[PDB]
Design an enzyme around this catalytic site. Structure first.
Site, PDB file in Angstrom:
ATOM      1  N   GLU A 150       0.780  -1.207  -0.112  1.00 56.76           N
ATOM      2  CA  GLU A 150       0.166  -0.021   0.074  1.00 56.76           C
ATOM      3  C   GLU A 150       0.727   1.052  -0.001  1.00 56.76           C
ATOM      4  OE1 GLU A 150      -3.238  -0.244   3.004  1.00 56.76           O
ATOM      5  OE2 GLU A 150      -4.203  -1.293   1.849  1.00 56.76           O
ATOM      6  N   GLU A 307      -6.819  -8.397  -0.623  1.00 58.40           N
ATOM      7  CA  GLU A 307      -7.032  -8.387   0.882  1.00 58.40           C
ATOM      8  C   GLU A 307      -8.529  -8.200   0.913  1.00 58.40           C
ATOM      9  OE1 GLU A 307      -4.811  -5.873   3.263  1.00 58.40           O
ATOM     10  OE2 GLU A 307      -2.860  -6.271   2.326  1.00 58.40           O
TER      11      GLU A 307
END
Ligand SMILES: OC[C@H]1O[C@H](O)[C@H](O)[C@@H](O)[C@H]1O
Ligand SMILES: [Zn+2]
Ligand SMILES: [Zn+2]
Ligand SMILES: [Zn+2]
Lengths: 675, 675, 675
Positions: A150, A307
């Site tokens: 991220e 995710e």
């Protein structure tokens, strides 16, 4: 397929056995097999464990992990570990640490916060990526590289400032061009040397997180920050490919995340991957729009769901549990919109600092006799049963809605017209209207070729970039319908106002001139009054937020404002342009109007709902060759029934043959295979 | 007694004649005698007046104050003045100044803000305490030393950072133990050297006041800070005791102040003292709980009420006057819960910066013909009349409710499961239920000896410390009843999850396994449905915030959830364990439910209300040898009547005999003396 | 006249052709003539265009602008360009940059933020103003100098800090006087050297923007910052006058802006000018009170409206358009209160960073065929037709209302008695009450010659300065009426309490002793109960926020509280004092009460409404020699009728003769000319 050697919807996720011991890994393998987990995302957060100083690397602990998983034939999504630097590196090489928005130099802590312009970070991240790739170049189980973790957040340190100046030299060439782009004659901002330019944050041009005096500087800084992080990613990517040219590379994205321009990022990525974490509170149609955007990043190529939580998420204000079936419901929503994997954070709960109360497949009790585990296990079996059926299937939408990060940046930095204008919300209003009628739609960049579509909707297209206007004039002229709204066509790529009358470059194709825009105080509305009944549109509807006061030039008037000093002036117009039509919506309408509008526009172009279903029963379609797969997803807490048509169709998930009236359980999912 | 030399309830408080002239001291003395004032807390804030540089000390001014009060036979609570350092010291020795949570180095200003790890501060603070005690060692009027003033606040400067590392080396011994205790394998946080460790604040691990990425680091920094400050207290204490070994030493505390572990602090203090400042807004039962906690810090020892306003407090958002009789009402509430002194801030109003609008006995008019003065004088006179009657009297509660600062710290730093979870509010929900039924109860530490009790309640005992489980098991098996709640038994002293199923070390004694916890969105509630009638519990009650989903193992199910996916599963259980019982309350119930629960738990153990009274008429008991003193306090603006019992008893405040039906005035207080 | 060479109400405003080119300048001139625009305010923000380094000055661009306008006989309000420094100056000479309230050193950005104690800024700002005045010393068109732009904001840098100390040496002379003025014996704050004193911000005594531990310091620093910026103004003013002694000099002020003491500023200014930006949301009587205050800054002298938007303002949360006629309404509202110019920001919209969505006469469409332009043109025409008629006309108010910045600062820095006390709100409650009855009123300083008034109202005169009490005693004894309120006469010029009983120095003239003050919690109120019908006051009214509990000494009680423990004590009193009267209002009363009170006080002194009109029809008066101009302004969206009186009078704007019943359109304005 995402990877030919792994021909099903991958099922697994973040796995961190280095937080545990050997014995627990034995238990992990056993429970993974029970649940149908066949992929593990490993080595995301172990930079420090691998590298203890400038010169020492230890991979033996990772070897053991890869080997143990390989014995189970579990596939590996191998991360480069660069998502969080070691404490020793932050201590010995502070150039690695960011300076924040408030102007403070950070100390070691957190994650995802390496300065993208740090010489130390780029040096060691590249070396680490290259060592991993080299060490494991011949290993059969690696199916994907997970670069860093991220990417995000802005840095305002000296290195970024010095490099921002260089980026500016390459972008503008001359101070003359820079001074013009930034409109620096305003407030005596004339720059006579590049070193005079500073990063925009709380010390300079910006305040309270989203305001700025100089939007062009703030806009370019965001572009530059996005690019700088992208360089880090590409840098690791190239080092990986050097050793494993055939192993795909991704990095995990965050959907409608404001700080990065993902259209630009996606071009650098073999496949898109993202992390979906809706609250109890999040509109279901919004998370559909997000999966949709993720598919749109590579013009409809399927993406990885990298995710999601199997249960609760610690970061939410209220760690609401996912009700029975909802985990599965939301996994299939993801697939429904382009996901060819369904993966979790994480496989076994940490113990364990800030995410110990984040849900996982295996949780603190340490066994499988658990409601969460059971649901995960059920899903895993179904994914096995599906095999490759759905893989690579694509959307064949005839409706598109446009979204753009640069446009969003400019709109969010703008001073006026209203703090109540929320760009994503406006885009979502239009998308929600389509979602509710099961009209198959694509989220698309402003650069997407428009020729496959019949209806293109550009909510609040404030910034119009080179080539855009020509492309929509063409689309519409050859028969398409284009829709756009108040406060569109105002500025070009430098947030400079296109003079001569809004909507600027779209004035011709829209057939209207917007004289002035009025911002409504909170709780104040106006009303859309139809001139006469028009398809599903009839009588009066409410609108709010902003009201464009416009003049019909070429366009026909379909509706007028009901009140205020612009009562009787146009609020919905239709411009016949070439063989097509464009619609200009001068305000933000309620959901009923947008329902009528979308219904009319689709009918006008002969696009039809995939299916008719009760409210909250979502239908989306992926097509593989000629076979159409209708994902039917019942978000209601009660059983629902709908007409599936007369076609010979079988529900992939039950085996049963469906026709005519069909019931779908609460939180239920059907995958209708037809032709 | 607090001090044999001074055998009544001390009456007086903070006195600052050094802000005035010798002449006004004549008036102060005249009015103090009028008011019944016999104790002065002097020299709290005159460090700079005493010491003008590294080497000069002037006590002559203080000599004259001490001598003037001695002429009136007024006793002295002598402060050491270290509560605020001199401006010259902050200028010449900035090591004295803190670095704040935002990472900024402070300049001179405010108070209570010396760096607790400052060499300069420790050096001069110790010398000042020493010079003060050596000078007055033989003085007959000193009854108490008042070290510093309201220690509190955290520092993040370099000296604190380096000493944090030392404190960690002493606490864990090795980096291996540190890395494990902190779970540093998470987010690549492995430390290879103590110097890599930094303080947790906005620059590193924490944000927005109570959030952290690493609760282990954040929890330990709080322990460290609390200890550091405590070391300053002990340092001054030791120096005082060197010269005056028989004069008690205290420092003033702030009740449920979150930042300091007062149970640890109290072990170092001869007597507890505290500063009670309730808002108009504050639940009367909360301030009761606070006095109670101050009693509990030293296991039932009476405490000093060092401060309270005689009227308004400037610091409250709305400086609400205390209505007629309320200053007195609240004073006796303190005494009812263990105060052997009643003292004010302050005796004469300042003139005078930020507290000029804080109430005092003598105020801006400068005379005694004043509503506030009269009420003070009236109290003073009653305190003279009471004499030593109540001194050293103690609570004989059979019911205890537990509170712990380290538990609170870990809960307040936790990411999840709910921002609507407030620890003190939960503790207060149980306490309030007891208070409403006039059940005598002790606030106690988690280490307290349990043998004296019949009912022990531990709301949200999230952290379970070494020896805790075995202690409660012994308590229950021997006949006691133990109550705990959702989200208890989760972690150890390091905020590491106790694996194998909640509630961990308490699982065996509670007879239940808590599988998972659900956080309710605001405005959402569930139902507690009784399986059958049980004492005063019948039918359905509300509960909210968090709902634990649990499985009865050994325990009996008394009530079930009435809604949501866990409907029909247990919400109240009772486990027979040896000769006793434990109850698990899986959610946060409404007041009606807790009323019924408390009545049942007490009845089961044979504990009874002190007295039955109307709402808002509070009753608490202190016992001296064989004599019971029931304090009856009517918080209502109206007269109230109640059954005082048939016993032979008198009201100390009127001398009258009371029996059967008795009425108590609005805001009134009775002290019933009985066997 | 503001300038004899320009004998009308000036019409024009900020103009920035250096953002454009010559061709657009030709369109500007053409459109300015269409709109009757005859004044341009130029060179406000071109410091960097003029000066590119320490040594180089280019005025050729400006010569051309001035020449071109001179060709159209448009007059020049010439700015010094010092309101925003050059990026190179910030880069090369960082002493020019401020340090903020959070202690942070700023970088280049924004505007209006040069350190007022900066040697670099003062050096070049003086030179720039000098060179401009020298270059254009003989230019006939320049009618006004516009020094800098909106001076404001505080600085906390080292230079300000050092200069703060010098300013304190000048003010107090000795540390002994300083320590007393500041009450530094409180919290051991004794200063033994000037260098121990620091600026009060978040690093020291202050927090949360308006809170402080030491108000004396905070108060003085605000005086100092205000003085320092004033020095900058004066410095430029003097250099300008050296070269052009007969050209008047101003700078543009911000009405009720809290940070500068404008009364002290105005003494240094030839004429006041200000920038009026009401929101859709702003009470019309409030913006009237602001124009009023601007007139009062120089004791009645007419002022310049330097700015207002012709349409929207980007800075407002909601950029709402001025409805048709409203721009005109609000322009004549300014004139009605003393404005002898009406000028805009700005003449043509920028393109262009943060203000591109600020309204202008010429907008992004770039032509005159627009709603906004036509409304500007229409007003432009009337202003031409009015010629010199209104110029120099003055208020002949018999009622005054006092406002003071130092009183404001002390009130806002005060710790208690209530965060619900808002000084300006209270002052406005009294002004509104007058406004609603068309009672001609002047906003005045606490120092104004009181002799011309019959009624003087001082809401919350918390701070009483030397000579003030004497001044109002003399005013009242000679026959005037004086009104003041709860929380008045509490402190002196250093925020030190005047001891011996509130209201201290005002106790004799008010004839009451205020014993204590009660702060009401939000949503709590009390009741004003009249003793007997008295003029327009009768029965009960509500009051709130704060309740003074007072004692009538010489004063008659006209009304008492209705509830709470002070029920039946005085809330309205009247004291006869010589030939005059004083009224004490012990609480903050509702609007109906203030209506009655005002009506009574005015009748008592024989003062009468200008005119009786419907709600929302504002009437105000300016008088020139023997002639009275009644400005009638209908804020309602509907036509309204009123008795205009029987006099011989014409509406200046229509030329019609008005008598008895008259109507006035929605948003309408009439200017009745009478004797
Ligand atoms: O409304 C915007 C306006 O604000 C003030 O009035 C300034 O003086 C102008 O330059 C402009 O910035
Ligand atoms: Zn950086
Ligand atoms: Zn420190
Ligand atoms: Zn400065």
């Amino acid at each position: 397929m995402i990877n030919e050697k792994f021909p099903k919807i991958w099922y697994g996720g973040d796995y961190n056995p280095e937080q545990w011991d050997k014995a627990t890994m034995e238990e992990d393998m056993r429970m993974f097999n029970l649940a149908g987990i066949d992929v593990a995302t490993v080595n995301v957060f172990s930079w420090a464990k691998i590298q203890r100083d400038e010169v020492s690397y230890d991979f033996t602990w990772l070897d053991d992990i890869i080997e143990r998983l390989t014995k189970e034939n579990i596939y590996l999504c191998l991360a480069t570990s660069t998502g969080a630097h070691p404490a020793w590196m932050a201590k010995k090489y502070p150039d690695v640490l960011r300076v924040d928005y408030e102007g403070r130099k950070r100390k070691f802590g957190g994650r995802h916060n390496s300065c993208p312009n740090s010489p130390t970070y780029r040096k060691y991240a590249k070396i680490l990526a290259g060592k991993l790739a080299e060490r494991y170049k011949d290993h059969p189980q690696i199916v994907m590289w997970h670069v860093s973790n991220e990417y995000g957040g802005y840095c305002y340190c000296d290195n970024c400032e010095k490099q921002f100046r260089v980026w500016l030299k390459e972008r503008y060439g001359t101070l003359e061009a820079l001074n013009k782009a930034w409109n620096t004659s305003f407030w005596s901002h004339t720059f006579y040397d590049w070193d005079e330019i500073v990063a925009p944050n709380a010390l300079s041009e910006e305040w309270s997180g989203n305001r700025t005096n100089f939007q062009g500087i703030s806009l370019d800084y965001r572009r530059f920050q996005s690019d700088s992080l992208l360089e880090c990613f590409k840098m690791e990517r190239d080092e990986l490919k050097r050793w494993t040219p055939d192993i795909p590379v991704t990095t995990n994205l965050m959907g409608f995340y404001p700080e990065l321009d993902y259209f630009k990022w996606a071009k650098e990525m073999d496949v898109v991957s993202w992390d979906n974490y809706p609250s109890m509170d999040t509109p279901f149609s919004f998370t559909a729009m997000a999966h949709n955007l993720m598919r749109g990043l590579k013009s409809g190529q399927p993406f990885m769901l990298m995710e999601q939580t199997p249960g609760v998420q610690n970061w939410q204000p209220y760690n609401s549990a996912k009700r029975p079936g909802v985990m599965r419901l939301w996994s299939y929503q993801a697939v429904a919109h382009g996901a060819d994997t369904v993966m979790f954070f994480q496989l076994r709960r940490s113990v364990g600092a800030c995410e110990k109360y984040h849900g996982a497949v295996i949780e603190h009790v340490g066994h499988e006799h658990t409601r969460v585990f059971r649901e995960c296990a059920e899903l895993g079996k179904e994914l096995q049963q599906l095999g490759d059926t759905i893989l690579d299937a694509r959307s064949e939408a005839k409706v598109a809605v446009m979204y753009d990060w640069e446009n969003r940046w400019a709109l969010e930095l703008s001073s006026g017209p209203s703090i109540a204008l929320n760009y994503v919300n406006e885009v979502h209003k239009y998308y929600d209207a389509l979602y509710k009628q099961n009209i198959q739609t694509d989220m698309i960049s402003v650069e997407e070729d428009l020729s496959k579509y019949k209806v293109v909707i550009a909510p609040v297209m404030y910034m119009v970039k080179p080539g855009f206007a020509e492309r929509v004039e063409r689309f519409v002229a050859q028969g398409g319908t284009f829709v756009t709204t108040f406060f569109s066509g105002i500025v070009n790529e430098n947030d400079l106002v296109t003079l001569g009358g809004y909507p600027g470059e779209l004035r011709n194709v829209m057939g209207i001139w917007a004289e002035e825009i009025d911002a409504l105080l909170p709780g104040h509305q106006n009303e859309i009054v139809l001139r006469q009944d028009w398809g599903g549109l009839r009588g009066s509807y409410s609108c709010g937020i902003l009201c464009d006061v416009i003049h019909a030039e070429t366009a026909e008037v379909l509706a007028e404002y009901g009140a205020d000093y612009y009562k009787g002036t146009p609020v919905l117009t239709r411009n016949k342009f070439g063989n097509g039509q464009s619609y200009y919506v001068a305000s933000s309408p309620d959901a009923d109007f947008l329902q009528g509008l979308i219904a009319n526009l689709c009918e006008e172009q002969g696009v039809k709902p995939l299916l008719n279903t009760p409210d909250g029963v979502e239908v989306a379609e992926r097509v593989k060759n000629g076979t159409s797969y209708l994902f039917v997803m019942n978000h209601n807490a009660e059983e629902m029934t709908f007409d599936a048509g007369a076609s010979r169709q079988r529900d992939l998930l039950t085996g049963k043959t469906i026709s005519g009236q069909a019931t779908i359980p609460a939180r239920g999912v059907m995958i209708l295979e037809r032709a």
